[PDB]
């Protein structure tokens, strides 16, 4: 009986490949041959945030592009002022082994999680004037890998249970369960319209999810190793992926297939973090070789190198206005990068 | 401008002072990782040192010996896959690995798990502590002779007792040959890779053994001393 179902499923896989091939007219690299190259980009460290004890694993940027939150494995969450470097809040986490952190769009809530399997939520704008644990979410049997905020009452959660879930802040229960991944889900990114989101798993595949329906729409299996980082294009029609096989891939929703791949011969180490710029022309990917590389999102050539970290970069973030880029690595140091005339 | 920024500067100074105060207690405590299979007696070990020395995710056990704080974390209810979340444990003082030597069936899996941990790129910096649990069960079953070890490890029939093997005051020499052969098997994997970056400390441990806390404290002290000497470029 199982043989019949497996044979039926095998045939359907060929149909997807044929449909994807039928639309493959030309590579994106071919059509971009007439565009002007970006050229070498010089980036210098404008601000250096230090004070964390253990290695920094994740960070996020605020909507106002003024404050950012960073997570370190010492059990401390610190909110940094990018302009004047003062620390506005220090949150002593209940669990030291934290792997992710999120910043609410309204700036009133901050969430974090890790190996504790609990999504701790902290309220900043409190009537008393002190940070406290607002709500703690439990139900995941695996480690907490990533989380993002849709609004003040809804939060998207990614864990190692090969499943994602949408949580209600007030109810504290899973509104929907996102099932279909086979490996541990590493990270997810929300579209600008906060309508659809995609998440990468440890199975060399990516899936398109819908928060309203809770069912898969598109699947991309272009990568060869486990996908570590993922980020949405600012236009909402594409998204890039980073994996351990030292290559970066850009996928488009309408095309349902890859456009090109970013790779180079001296790079033998995978990518940990990846994000786009405001215009989307620059693709910044944090590699494991103690520095970050900037890739052209149309020409796929190297635009620059963000060196200065003694250890692997674990997180990368670009502000909503593209004014600066801040990178966090395992040396407990945060480097903010900006251009010059 | 400066009037409003004064409060921010004072708050930042207070946060820095709190961070500096917490840094001392953070660095005073030593972090440890506990790894092992289901058959290994990790539960017995943690029960023994949590009583004598004072969905859920990972667990935490805090014990103090010789006025030194130690923290150890267990895997907990995590999934079987561990290649992804084990990289964050690369800053712990050492890993306590528990192996059941009285079964001869899951021993090969224990060897493979130890080899992967030892050869891991992120875990190659920090040392691993080896505990060979359930020695009494190993001694009893090898004395009975119903279950053999040569069938699972044919190299045992030609293996000889090391000259430096110091046994207990009284026990059958067959037990000594069996336990040291397993130890020699583990140290072969440990010495197969690593040019002095990390070391392995084999120790014989029983379920009711109350000296586990002392052995961990001595092993942690040796690792700290060796790391300091490495920083001095003396070793």
């Amino acid at each position, epitope marked *: 009986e199982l043989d019949q179902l497996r044979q039926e499923a095998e045939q359907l896989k060929n149909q997807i490949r044929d449909a994807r091939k039928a639309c493959a007219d030309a590579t994106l690299s071919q059509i971009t041959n007439n565009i002007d190259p970006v050229g070498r980009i010089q980036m210098r460290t404008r601000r250096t945030l230090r004070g964390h004890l253990a290695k920094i694993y994740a960070m996020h940027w605020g909507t106002d592009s003024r404050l950012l939150v960073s997570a370190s494995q010492d059990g401390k969450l610190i909110i940094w002022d990018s302009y004047t470097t003062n620390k506005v809040h220090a949150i002593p986490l209940r669990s030291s082994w934290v792997m992710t952190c999120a910043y609410a769009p309204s700036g009133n809530y901050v969430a974090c999680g890790g190996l504790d399997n609990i999504c701790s939520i902290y309220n900043l704008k409190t009537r008393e004037g002190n940070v406290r644990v607002s709500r703690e979410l439990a139900g995941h049997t695996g480690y907490l890998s990533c989380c993002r905020f849709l609004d003040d009452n809804q939060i998207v959660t990614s864990s190692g249970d090969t499943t994602c879930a949408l949580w209600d802040i007030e109810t504290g229960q899973q509104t929907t369960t996102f099932t279909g991944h086979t490996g541990d889900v590493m990270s997810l990114s929300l579209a600008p319209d906060t309508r659809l989101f995609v998440s990468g798993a440890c*199975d060399a595949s990516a899936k398109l999810w819908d928060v309203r329906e809770g069912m898969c729409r598109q699947t991309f299996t272009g990568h060869e190793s*486990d996908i570590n980082a993922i980020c949405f294009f600012p236009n909402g029609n594409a998204f890039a992926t980073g994996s*351990d096989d030292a290559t970066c891939r850009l996928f488009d929703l309408r095309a349902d297939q890859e456009l090109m791949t970013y790779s180079h011969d001296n790079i*033998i180490c995978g990518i940990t973090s990846v994000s786009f710029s405001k215009s989307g022309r620059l693709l910044l990917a944090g590699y494991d070789d103690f520095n970050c590389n900037v890739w052209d999102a149309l020409k796929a050539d190297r635009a620059g190198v963000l060196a200065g970290h003694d250890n692997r970069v674990s997180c990368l973030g670009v502000t909503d206005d593209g004014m600066a880029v801040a990178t966090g690595s395992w040396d407990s140091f945060l480097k903010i990068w900006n251009g010059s005339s | 401008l400066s009037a409003e920024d004064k409060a921010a500067v004072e708050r930042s100074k207070m946060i820095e002072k709190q961070l500096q105060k917490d840094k001392q207690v953070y660095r005073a405590t030593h972090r440890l990782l506990l790894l092992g299979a289901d058959n290994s007696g990790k539960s017995t070990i943690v029960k023994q040192m949590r009583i004598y020395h004072v969905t859920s995710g990972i667990f935490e056990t805090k014990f103090q010996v010789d006025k030194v704080n130690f923290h150890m974390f267990d895997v907990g209810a995590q999934r079987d896959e561990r*290649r992804k979340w084990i990289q964050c444990f690369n800053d712990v003082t050492a890993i306590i690995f528990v192996v059941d030597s009285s079964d001869y069936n899951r021993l*090969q899996e224990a060897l493979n798990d130890f080899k992967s941990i030892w050869n891991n790129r992120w875990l190659r910096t920090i040392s691993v502590i080896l505990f060979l649990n359930k020695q009494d069960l190993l001694a009893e079953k090898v004395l009975a002779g119903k279950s053999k070890i040569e069938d699972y490890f044919p*190299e045992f029939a030609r293996y000889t007792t090391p000259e430096d093997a110091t046994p207990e005051p009284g026990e059958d020499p067959r037990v000594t040959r069996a336990k040291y052969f397993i130890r020699d098997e583990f140290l072969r994997i440990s010495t197969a890779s690593g040019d002095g970056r990390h070391y392995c400390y084999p120790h014989f441990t029983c379920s009711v053994d109350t000296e586990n806390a002392r052995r961990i404290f001595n092993d942690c002290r040796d690792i700290i001393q060796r790391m300091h000497l490495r920083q001095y470029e003396l070793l």
Partner: nanobody
Amino acid sequence: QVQLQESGGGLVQPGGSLRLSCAASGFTFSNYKMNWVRQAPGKGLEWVSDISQSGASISYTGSVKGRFTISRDNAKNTLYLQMNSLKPEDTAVYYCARCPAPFTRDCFDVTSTTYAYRGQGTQVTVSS
């Protein structure tokens, strides 16, 4: 898409010989280390043998030490494992598993219950 498919098996008299084959695709086979796993009926997955990227380093399990020979051919994109001197305790479903990341010297989740880089396996039965 990364996929693996093993071949070879069936009913073999005890003491016979076999030669499993699997054709890797969707990734650079020369840059990934490969392992072999069998699952006995009623028993968990256990490591069998492995071979390095270039084949310079080869290791075997004690129960299969010297019995079996494992080799890879990067040109033909195919992995091989010679099985001779079979005994009826060797009946198991043999799976071919890959390592998570390329250019690595550590291969962790091969023996895990669920793995995304292993083939469907082939039935190998040794009965008289």
